[PDB]
Amino acid sequence: RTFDLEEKLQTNKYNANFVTFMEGKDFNVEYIQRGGLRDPLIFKNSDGLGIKMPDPDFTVNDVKMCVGSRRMVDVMDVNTQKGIEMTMAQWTRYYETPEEEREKLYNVISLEFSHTRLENMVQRPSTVDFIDWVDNMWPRHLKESQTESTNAILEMQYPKVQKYCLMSVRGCYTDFHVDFGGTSVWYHIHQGGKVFWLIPPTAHNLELYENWLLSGKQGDIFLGDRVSDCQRIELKQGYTFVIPSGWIHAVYTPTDTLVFGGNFLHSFNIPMQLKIYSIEDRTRVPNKFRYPFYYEMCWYVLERYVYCITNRSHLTKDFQKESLSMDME
């Protein structure tokens, strides 16, 4: 990296105001219908969101015992932004190592913990349940059949992207990106704090992002310096943040932090979801870093809208019977 991260954290120049500060009570389906979830949101308290989180003093070792010591986890090397893997016991050893004894700076942003003991300890904002394509569009008997708690693709029965645990030591940095498939993100700071830089997904900024990706100079060009308006904002302990489809963001961790968060597609910004998918296609992102079963899900969306509105099903008879059985439960 040739740019100076400390100057990007200190400058006052990222002074756009894109975020709406909302009360949880007001984040409801009517709000999504009216505004298309186009604006980043911060909830400084959780009242009215319907979230649930682990004990306030939950630790990385607690996360380990809930997902398993031997669970393989994807880790980022912050210096290179490249991936590596280790087990959760090895990650916990790293995270518990005093700061001055750690050789390298590593971040975990990708531990998806559905189908483990941790899953029932964390619930995301209720409103997300009403709009996520996984919950509302994917055939329910397939989602319910998932047993595997890792993200192994051969055992994945639906897009397994709903519930992630992020564990970040002080100094961690995640460089600018757009979340896979143009997913929207919810992010709850359980302990610690985060600094985000936000860039809006205008056509011009998405063209800059794609060219920056294709240039391979991400370590040299701090992308927030290339755009007309960027907002740097701090998220404190207890805040919940929702990032809309397409938003180009980078994240710095000023203190050891534990976050719970997750991704979702929804029906109110499909053009942006499709735009982001095509950027990933053109820039040759490996499938492992993409939303699983993306076009499969888009076909199930079309079928649900036609069925719900017109009562004409385009599912096979067997799939219709699987659904009818679940309606009678």
């Binding site: 998806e112 994945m156 992207v161 990706l213 499938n287 870093f289």
Partner: peptide, 13 residues
């Protein structure tokens, strides 16, 4: 060596 999907990571430098 099983293939995975839904891994969150930006691009490497």
């Amino acid at each position: 060596a099983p293939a995975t999907g839904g891994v969150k990571k930006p691009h490497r430098y």
